[PDB]
Design a protein around this nucleic acid. Structure first.
Lengths: 62, 205, 85, 90, 82, 80
RNA sequence: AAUUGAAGAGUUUGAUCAUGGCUCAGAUUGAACGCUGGCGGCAGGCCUAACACAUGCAAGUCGAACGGUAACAGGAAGAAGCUUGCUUCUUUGCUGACGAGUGGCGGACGGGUGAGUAAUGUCUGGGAAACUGCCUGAUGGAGGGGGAUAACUACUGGAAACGGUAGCUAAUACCGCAUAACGUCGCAAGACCAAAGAGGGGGACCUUCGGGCCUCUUGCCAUCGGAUGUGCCCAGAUGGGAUUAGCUAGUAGGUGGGGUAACGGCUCACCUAGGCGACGAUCCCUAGCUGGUCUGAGAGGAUGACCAGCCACACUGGAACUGAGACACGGUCCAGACUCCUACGGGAGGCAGCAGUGGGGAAUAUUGCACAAUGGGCGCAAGCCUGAUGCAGCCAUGCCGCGUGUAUGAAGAAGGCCUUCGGGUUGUAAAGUACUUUCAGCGGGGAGGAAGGGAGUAAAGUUAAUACCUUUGCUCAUUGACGUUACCCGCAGAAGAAGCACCGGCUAACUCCGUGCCAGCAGCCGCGGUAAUACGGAGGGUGCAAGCGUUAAUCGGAAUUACUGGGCGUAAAGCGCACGCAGGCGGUUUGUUAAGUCAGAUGUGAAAUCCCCGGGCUCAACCUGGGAACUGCAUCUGAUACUGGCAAG
């Protein structure tokens, strides 16, 4: 199947063990899933300090 | 999980005072109440029906700091019993320990009141209780621990609360803090600015 | 496994060796009776039936054969002979 | 803890229920123990006898037949990371 | 061999028992014939700690039941004159 | 008294036996309409007595055959 | 007293009303994942590969059945050091005990799993042709003898596992014989069948010095019943598909022999030519069932985890033994696959038992502690064993309780974010002031969960006996895994402890900057083309809270499967029309039956769960008392309108 790559700047490639969670990406025809960023070889996004429970960015240190 | 934030900001989001920061300055001067909950709280919304149900649900919540998970349990409890769910919701909520601590005047604010209760300095009916959500059962009594008595928080609570309206269904000893609670809390014996059908309508769905 | 109640295996083997012999002792006496019913001679059928009756009832006391089975084998024989003669 | 104790006659397992001083035995379990560890008796005086860590020398590399074994590659070599002192992973 | 034993109910460190007539082969809290009374070992000061159905326990005696250890002891603790 | 049915004789092409049909006007569980729910029983009887089309009192008994476990009491309403 | 209970919104169009799907607001979870993360209580924790499994444990006990004693400690005639009774040792099963074996009982219970199983099963309500260790009541006996055989011995085979050969001693082991009845068979007369002795104490007679004798305790075998459990039959209920129409040949029934604990084609012989099927047979796919859980106003829909009843399986397939009960998890035998030991000859085993491992997967734990309490096995009992169970560990997975402070405090601070540039907002929020100080950290006290059981003693039984044994009060010393427990008391100090999502409408909550159909957001409608409250970053604000969202999942909303409770002229939908069997429904009158129907009674509807009035842990979750309830089902006795059957008009 296909899946969407949320956020921006993904380090994905030809083979990567990733994790998949369902969800309609309506504007894209025939893509029904979302790669969950915070999982395996699909790493987290940079500069995503807000709404970081999705896209898997950790809390900045303080 | 208690509230632990800036205090009167909730009162400016509710316009009126819910007596949340009474204390020594018994007059709300440095508060600028009603028209400034935030950077854009200097205006007014059309304030939809869902909102006027929620904001009324927020007021009955914020006087006693009851979290939603704990708050919804009362609605499950009030509708379980007999009588009216509008009347039962506040009645079982009046039986909270810090509510009877406040109604007997042992605390001037509920945050000041619960600090006494959580630190187990109150011997209600013959047993010291540190959990504020304890139902103070009808026709009972409530005492204060003598070995932690009168450390300048109790006396200021004795001063101010005897200027404030002198509650009805209970008797304060006023000399050495021996509270007695007698009867069922009636709908007519209330603050009365709160509504009740706003809440039980919201909790149907 | 090597549990020390595995003697129940060899305690059953000497038990079955005791049984099957004495179980066949009963059955062979039934064969002698049944052969006489194919023969038809009455006194040979009666005496054999009068012979194995103490053998049949005795193993019921040892419990190798149920009482009603032992009661059935009495009722089997006497019914066959009476209809014959 | 101490799970099981074995005298270990060349990777053969015989059970030991009590160990004396001066004997060699294998303790089974022991999640976080390293090389040359000074296992002492707690609720008692604590001792120490360890001072040595040898050298690494030649570092080469590897890459498996596919990327589907890469999780086992870090695991099985990580399984080998616990064993040998002079054997590092980069 | 139907017996009259105890079945443990309640939470950890705060037990409770209901003395039940059951077939002795079966499990403790499992399949039983009839519950006859109960017992509380941490029975805080209210008079209700045991309400033993004495007449059926006396009836099951005639049916050949084997009254267990503490069950017999509770009858000796809650006497046949009170 | 004892448990005894009414039935109707159906298949009598055999010896010392009968398959009876007993009508059950049960209520449907969800739709509330009464359905003529049939029930057919291999029923034992004595020597070959009756024919098809006659109501027959029948009671439960020993499993006389593999399937036949009921006994015909009496034959009522002989017809053509 | 015990159901005081049902909402809607967005979205087609330029706009409207409908039909109509899609989506959200709610609850729930054996949940995973992302970010964060303080503590306590009760819970739950392999849903996928019934995939293969290393290691330790998961079932033993009995000396009050018996020959014996290999260990351990003994009185014990004695031995030798030689501190002449201080001790090294030799005797010896004569004591308390006790491996190895014979024998008795258990191991068929508990514990696990849901592959198979669509009906051999399960739930519900009934039945007749049975069996049932142990426990129990009653009625009696309990006479007399025998031959081997373990163990162990002498030889010997092997690496072990395990033997093999020749002698040998006991038994509550086994085998006759006597003698039988309310027993089995038989129309009858009659014929035939059982059993075992052990343990304590002792006046007196007798002591071949054992014992017999007496009493007491217990066991034993026969018959008829109880209780409990078990096997069996019958009616109904119990999934999807007709793109699954015929199906079956010991198959449907009889008769007779045999089999069966008992019934039967159960299993054969011979005969009859039938049996099941449109109320769905046969066939294919999927599935353990139920009490109930979840949701729903209810009716229903989904589901069957944990706890409890039942059933099936125990590496795969087949068979039987033993025994009260198994066609048997930790038994046997055989076939197959897969592993392990080896001296190469030959043997060994089954985690779907508790942990634990590799693996599969998004996804789930400790090779832990004690037999202290409850329960079970054996035993007179003491006790032994018990991965049942009670507890502890890890994991916010869930539910519930609690904290991270309270009050005061305005120059309305600084700083940040804005500013119609004057101010405003953050915000009494901080600082500072004075107090409180739970839980955590620390030091001392401290329940209950413990009833029993052990030795002694007095009393009543008890017997020829003040003995024994039994019961009863009574005293002493004791039994706590958890556990530096629950709880309590004091010390130091605000001090160790707050996040995650959203903010265009739905929906509670906005500005600025960057960015320009790009980067990206998104459950739906839809935003972004240089002034974006929807994109990302700040500030502000709202929601919830030790959790918060995302995804998956089920019902709800959905009256979008409409039984309650929908439609069909144009919105999806009258077969093109007609005849007609099954089947559905059926004018009117009387009589009769009571099937349906309704009323009352009875049995049952397991417990728990759910609901109400109560009780106990400080509250609560939670455990728990009675009741109600389980709306059902079956039977019995009535009523005769209505529906049906029958008879007549």
């Amino acid at each position: 199947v296909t899946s969407y790559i949320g956020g921006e700047g993904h380090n994905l490639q030809e083979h990567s063990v990733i994790l998949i969670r369902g969800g309609r990406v309506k504007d894209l025809p025939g893509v029904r899933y979302h790669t969950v960023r915070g999982a395996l070889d699909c790493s987290g996004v940079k500069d995503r300090k807000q709404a970081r429970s999705k896209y898997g960015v950790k809390r900045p240190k303080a | 999980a208690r509230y632990l934030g800036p205090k009167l900001k909730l009162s400016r989001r509710e316009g009126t005072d819910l007596f949340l920061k009474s204390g020594v300055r018994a007059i709300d001067t440095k508060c600028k109440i009603e028209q400034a909950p935030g950077q854009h709280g200097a205006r007014k919304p059309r304030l939809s029906d869902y909102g006027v149900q929620l904001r009324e649900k927020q007021k009955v919540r914020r006087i006693y700091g009851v979290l939603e998970r704990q708050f919804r349990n009362y609605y499950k409890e009030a509708a379980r019993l007999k009588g009216n769910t509008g009347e039962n919701l506040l009645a079982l909520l009046e039986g909270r320990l810090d509510n009877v601590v406040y109604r007997m005047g042992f605390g001037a604010t509920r945050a000041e009141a619960r600090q006494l209760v959580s630190h187990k300095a109150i011997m209600v009916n013959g047993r010291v209780v540190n959990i504020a959500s304890y139902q103070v059962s009808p026709n009972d009594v409530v005492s204060i621990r003598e070995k932690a008595k009168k450390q300048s928080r109790v006396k200021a609570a004795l001063e101010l609360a005897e200027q404030r309206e002198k509650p009805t269904w209970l008797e304060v000893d006023a000399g050495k803090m021996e509270g007695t609670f007698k009867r069922k809390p009636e709908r007519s014996d209330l603050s009365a600015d709160i509504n009740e059908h706003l809440i039980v309508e919201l909790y149907s769905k | 496994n090597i549990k020390s109640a595995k003697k129940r295996a060899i305690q059953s083997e000497k038990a079955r060796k005791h049984n099957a012999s004495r179980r066949s002792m009963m059955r062979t006496f039934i064969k002698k009776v049944y052969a006489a019913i194919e023969a038809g001679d009455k006194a040979a059928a009666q005496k054999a039936f009068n012979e194995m009756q103490p053998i049949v009832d005795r193993q019921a006391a040892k419990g190798l054969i149920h009482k009603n089975k032992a009661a059935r084998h009495k009722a089997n024989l006497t019914a066959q002979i009476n209809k014959l003669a | 803890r101490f799970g099981r104790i074995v005298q270990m006659h060349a990777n053969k397992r015989e059970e030991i229920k009590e160990v004396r001083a001066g004997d060699i035995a294998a303790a089974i379990g022991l999640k976080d123990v390293t090389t040359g560890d000074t296992l002492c008796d707690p609720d008692a005086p604590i001792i120490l006898e360890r001072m040595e860590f040898p050298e690494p020398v030649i570092s080469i590399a590897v890459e498996p037949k596919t990327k589907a074994d890469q999780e086992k590659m870090g695991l099985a070599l990580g399984r080998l990371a616990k064993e040998d002192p002079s054997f590092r992973v980069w | 061999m139907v017996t009259i034993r105890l079945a443990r109910h309640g939470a950890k460190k705060r037990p409770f028992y209901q003395v039940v007539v059951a077939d002795s082969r079966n499990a403790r809290n499992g399949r039983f014939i009839e519950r006859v009374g109960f017992f509380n070992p941490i029975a805080s000061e209210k008079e209700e700690g045991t309400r033993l159905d004495l007449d059926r326990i006396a009836h099951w005696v005639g049916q050949g039941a084997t009254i267990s250890d503490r069950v017999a002891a509770l009858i000796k603790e809650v006497n046949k004159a009170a | 008294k004892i448990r005894t049915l009414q039935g109707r004789v159906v298949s009598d092409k055999m010896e010392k036996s009968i398959v009876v049909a007993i009508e059950r006007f049960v209520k449907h569980p969800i739709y509330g309409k009464f359905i003529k729910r049939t029930t057919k029983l291999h029923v034992h009887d004595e020597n070959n007595e009756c024919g098809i089309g006659d109501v027959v009192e029948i009671r439960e008994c020993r499993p006389l055959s593999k399937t036949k476990s009921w006994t015909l009491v009496r034959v009522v309403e002989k017809a053509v």
